Amino acid sequence: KLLELLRKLLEALHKAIELLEKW
Amino acid sequence: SKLLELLRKLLEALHKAIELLEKWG
Amino acid sequence: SKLLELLRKLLEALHKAIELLEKW
Amino acid sequence: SKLLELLRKLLEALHKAIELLEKW
Amino acid sequence: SKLLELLRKLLEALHKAIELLEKW
Amino acid sequence: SKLLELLRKLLEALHKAIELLEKW
Amino acid sequence: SKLLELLRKLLEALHKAIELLEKW
Amino acid sequence: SKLLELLRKLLEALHKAIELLEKW
Amino acid sequence: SKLLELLRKLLEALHKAIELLEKW
Amino acid sequence: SKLLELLRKLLEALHKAIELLEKWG
Amino acid sequence: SKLLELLRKLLEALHKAIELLEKWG
Amino acid sequence: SKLLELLRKLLEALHKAIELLEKWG
Amino acid sequence: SKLLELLRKLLEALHKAIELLEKWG
Amino acid sequence: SKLLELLRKLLEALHKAIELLEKWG
Amino acid sequence: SKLLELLRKLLEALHKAIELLEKWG
Amino acid sequence: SKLLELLRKLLEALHKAIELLEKW
Amino acid sequence: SKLLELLRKLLEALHKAIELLEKW
Amino acid sequence: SKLLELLRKLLEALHKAIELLEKW
Amino acid sequence: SKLLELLRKLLEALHKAIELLEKWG
Amino acid sequence: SKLLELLRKLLEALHKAIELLEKWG
Amino acid sequence: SKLLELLRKLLEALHKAIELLEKW
Amino acid sequence: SKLLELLRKLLEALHKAIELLEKWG
Amino acid sequence: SKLLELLRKLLEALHKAIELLEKW
Amino acid sequence: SKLLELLRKLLEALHKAIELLEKWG
Amino acid sequence: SKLLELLRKLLEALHKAIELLEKW
Amino acid sequence: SKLLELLRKLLEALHKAIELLEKW
Amino acid sequence: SKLLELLRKLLEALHKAIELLEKW
Amino acid sequence: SKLLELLRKLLEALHKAIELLEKW
Amino acid sequence: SKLLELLRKLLEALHKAIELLEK
Amino acid sequence: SKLLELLRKLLEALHKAIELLEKW
Amino acid sequence: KLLELLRKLLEALHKAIELLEKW
Amino acid sequence: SKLLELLRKLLEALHKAIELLEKWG
Numbered sequence: 001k002l003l004e005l006l007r008k009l010l011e012a013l014h015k016a017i018e019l020l021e022k023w
Numbered sequence: 024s025k026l027l028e029l030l031r032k033l034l035e036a037l038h039k040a041i042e043l044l045e046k047w048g
Numbered sequence: 049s050k051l052l053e054l055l056r057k058l059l060e061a062l063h064k065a066i067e068l069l070e071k072w
Numbered sequence: 073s074k075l076l077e078l079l080r081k082l083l084e085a086l087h088k089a090i091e092l093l094e095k096w
Numbered sequence: 097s098k099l100l101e102l103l104r105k106l107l108e109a110l111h112k113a114i115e116l117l118e119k120w
Numbered sequence: 121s122k123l124l125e126l127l128r129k130l131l132e133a134l135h136k137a138i139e140l141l142e143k144w
Numbered sequence: 145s146k147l148l149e150l151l152r153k154l155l156e157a158l159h160k161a162i163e164l165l166e167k168w
Numbered sequence: 169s170k171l172l173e174l175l176r177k178l179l180e181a182l183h184k185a186i187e188l189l190e191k192w
Numbered sequence: 193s194k195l196l197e198l199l200r201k202l203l204e205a206l207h208k209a210i211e212l213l214e215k216w
Numbered sequence: 217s218k219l220l221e222l223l224r225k226l227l228e229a230l231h232k233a234i235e236l237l238e239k240w241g
Numbered sequence: 242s243k244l245l246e247l248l249r250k251l252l253e254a255l256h257k258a259i260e261l262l263e264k265w266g
Numbered sequence: 267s268k269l270l271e272l273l274r275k276l277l278e279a280l281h282k283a284i285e286l287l288e289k290w291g
Numbered sequence: 292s293k294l295l296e297l298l299r300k301l302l303e304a305l306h307k308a309i310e311l312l313e314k315w316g
Numbered sequence: 317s318k319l320l321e322l323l324r325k326l327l328e329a330l331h332k333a334i335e336l337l338e339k340w341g
Numbered sequence: 342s343k344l345l346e347l348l349r350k351l352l353e354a355l356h357k358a359i360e361l362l363e364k365w366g
Numbered sequence: 367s368k369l370l371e372l373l374r375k376l377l378e379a380l381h382k383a384i385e386l387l388e389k390w
Numbered sequence: 391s392k393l394l395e396l397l398r399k400l401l402e403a404l405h406k407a408i409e410l411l412e413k414w
Numbered sequence: 415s416k417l418l419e420l421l422r423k424l425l426e427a428l429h430k431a432i433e434l435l436e437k438w
Numbered sequence: 439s440k441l442l443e444l445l446r447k448l449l450e451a452l453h454k455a456i457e458l459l460e461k462w463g
Numbered sequence: 464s465k466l467l468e469l470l471r472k473l474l475e476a477l478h479k480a481i482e483l484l485e486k487w488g
Numbered sequence: 489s490k491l492l493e494l495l496r497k498l499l500e501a502l503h504k505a506i507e508l509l510e511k512w
Numbered sequence: 513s514k515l516l517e518l519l520r521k522l523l524e525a526l527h528k529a530i531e532l533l534e535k536w537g
Numbered sequence: 538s539k540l541l542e543l544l545r546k547l548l549e550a551l552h553k554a555i556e557l558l559e560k561w
Numbered sequence: 562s563k564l565l566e567l568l569r570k571l572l573e574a575l576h577k578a579i580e581l582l583e584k585w586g
Numbered sequence: 587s588k589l590l591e592l593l594r595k596l597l598e599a600l601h602k603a604i605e606l607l608e609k610w
Numbered sequence: 611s612k613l614l615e616l617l618r619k620l621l622e623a624l625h626k627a628i629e630l631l632e633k634w
Numbered sequence: 635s636k637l638l639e640l641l642r643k644l645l646e647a648l649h650k651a652i653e654l655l656e657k658w
Numbered sequence: 659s660k661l662l663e664l665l666r667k668l669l670e671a672l673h674k675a676i677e678l679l680e681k682w
Numbered sequence: 683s684k685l686l687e688l689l690r691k692l693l694e695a696l697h698k699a700i701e702l703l704e705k
Numbered sequence: 706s707k708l709l710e711l712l713r714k715l716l717e718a719l720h721k722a723i724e725l726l727e728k729w
Numbered sequence: 730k731l732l733e734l735l736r737k738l739l740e741a742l743h744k745a746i747e748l749l750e751k752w
Numbered sequence: 753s754k755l756l757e758l759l760r761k762l763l764e765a766l767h768k769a770i771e772l773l774e775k776w777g
Binding site for chain 9: 276
């Protein structure tokens with residue numbers, strides 16, 4: 001629920017950061 | 024690649040949010 | 049009326065992931 | 073530009089998840 | 097007397113939207 | 121069904137916005 | 145800007161509700 | 169997909185209806 | 193139907209005018 | 217340059233549309 | 242680009258005004 | 267009815283987009 | 292209402308070419 | 317379902333181009 | 342250009358079948 | 367009406383078939 | 391053959407009458 | 415105004431035709 | 439059977455077209 | 464133009480009506 | 489009969505003349 | 513074919529013009 | 538020029554026979 | 562060649578529309 | 587009256603058409 | 611329904627059309 | 635003058651469309 | 659793939675259109 | 683969280699400056 | 706108001722620049 | 730690192746107050 | 753000029769911020 005939402009958001013967030021780190 | 028991973032995880036978070044909505048009234 | 053906004057900006061974010069996918 | 077705004081949203085959504093969970 | 101109504105309209109449309117999105 | 125009514129009240133919200141536009 | 149543009153995104157939402165009625 | 173896009177722009181419409189009444 | 197579609201594509205055109213004015 | 221004139225054009229056309237909206241419905 | 246896009250939406254608009262005269266004419 | 271004023275409006279707006287394609291072209 | 296509508300349909304064809312382009316990378 | 321739409325807008329533009337050349341030859 | 346015309350009218354006819362199915366389903 | 371426009375396009379299309387055949 | 395092509399001339403004529411009326 | 419009845423006539427001939435068509 | 443009536447209809451149609459040729463041309 | 468067209472195809476309709484009336488009959 | 493037929497051959501003559509005039 | 517399809521039709525009109533001349537002469 | 542004058546006199550013929558008819 | 566199969570299918574779709582006219586209109 | 591000069595009009599039409607045909 | 615069958619046969623026809631399209 | 639060039643270009647676009655359709 | 663060249667073509671024909679738009 | 687807070691406020695600031703220059 | 710919101714923001718990320726320094 | 734970050738923030742803030750004190 | 757320099761500075765500030773982030777994860 002709330003913390004599952006949190007988990008996924010942080011995941012997606014780090015994903016994005018390293019993605020531009022590449023691009 | 025990691026882009027698609029990104030969007031998949033964002034979709035799972037999406038479904039999450041929608042579920043939370045379905046509950047919270 | 050606040051998780052609504054969580055929802056939304058998330059949706060926008062999703063759509064922007066989509067848009068990056070499109071441009072590339 | 074587009075990725076940057078996407079980050080803006082990712083965070084804002086997150087920060088929002090914070091706000092909610094903190095309140096509950 | 098009209099703006100509020102506008103908002104509630106979007107909120108009920110949103111209610112139906114949430115329901116059909118969760119189900120569909 | 122659900123979507124039919126959704127569309128209906130969507131139209132409603134629409135007409136309201138139009139009313140506000142025309143009034144001011 | 146931020147009222148006619150409100151009207152715009154509503155009209156869009158309406159457009160795509162139609163599109164969904166068509167398909168389904 | 170188009171259902172999520174609808175939900176998206178509906179909430180954005182609602183966001184701007186809010187911004188409107190939040191002073192007017 | 194037809195007329196709301198008219199207002200719709202006109203608004204979109206106007207919205208793009210806004211974008212162009214602002215950027216260029 | 218002429219973007220502003222073109223914008224004004226879209227705008228006035230829009231006024232026209234909403235005015236006509238006012239008068240049938 | 243976005244310029245051509247707006248030209249398009251203008252044209253579809255103009256054409257729907259065309260059709261509106263054809264109907265309520 | 268004012269649909270004809272409306273049509274003229276779209277028309278000169280199109281003229282404007284065209285003159286754009288010219289000048290900023 | 293003839294050449295400009297030629298223009299319309301060209302732009303729309305270009306719109307849809309664009310569209311299905313913007314799914315294959 | 318959209319490639320075919322592209323075909324038709326293309327050939328409709330094409331056909332209008334014909335009609336134009338046929339009146340202006 | 343004759344088969345062309347055949348294709349043009351064919352796709353158009355096709356489209357109108359589509360549009361009636363989207364009026365009736 | 368709309369069916370009849372389809373009917374018309376169909377009849378033409380097939381007349382074109384006639385035309386192509388008789389020559390070929 | 392000639393039956394359907396009779397129909398064809400009928401429909402095209404209908405079409406031209408339609409277009410004239412629309413011009414009015 | 416005569417176009418009114420002219421087009422009525424075309425339509426009538428047209429249904430007569432397609433009546434015969436289905437009967438054939 | 440109603441073929442003769444079909445002929446009558448095409449006739450009356452031409453009649454009106456003739457009267458209109460007079461009316462405008 | 465555009466009405467000699469209508470006149471013209473109406474008449475062809477008349478002519479084919481004539482023929483099929485007389486042929487089987 | 490025969491004048492209306494006269495008319496038709498006149499007319500198709502007209503149109504098959506316009507035909508070649510277009511591409512000629 | 514247009515070349516002399518063209519003439520066939522005019523000439524037949526003329527044939528019947530002779531015919532009508534003689535009859536209603 | 539060449540085909541033009543031809544179509545022209547063809548048209549004079551047309552309006553002639555048109556009168557022929559329109560008489561009765 | 563396959564022109565002819567195309568023809569047969571056009572005819573078939575034609576009667577399909579005709580009987581759809583029977584059922585609807 | 588003048589139920590013949592159509593002959594003249596088609597005649598001149600024919601003069602010009604045979605002119606073109608024999609010309610090229 | 612029958613309408614859809616109508617559509618589907620239009621499909622296979624257009625298929626054979628674009629099939630013809632290849633040799634030239 | 636450029637009508638022709640536009641024609642040629644639409645035609646070429648048509649060729650490539652045709653053959654990309656031949657592809658898929 | 660050849661979608662790219664096709665798009666280039668479309669834009670070309672478009673530019674030529676615009677040139678006509680420009681001179682006239 | 684604190685760094686993300688830094689970032690987020692930087693990003694919103696970026697876009698607010700952007701929206702202002704659009705004037 | 707955009708100026709004060711922006712100012713507000715510059716100050717806030719400033720404070721966190723500070724507090725993050727005083728931490729790390 | 731975080732230091733110069735704070736610094737640049739102060740710089741940008743000076744620019745903002747400069748834009749503000751105009752009217 | 754004013755906002756130009758503001759945006760330049762703000763951009764590089766964000767740049768080094770994302771640098772620290774990307775560093776820490």
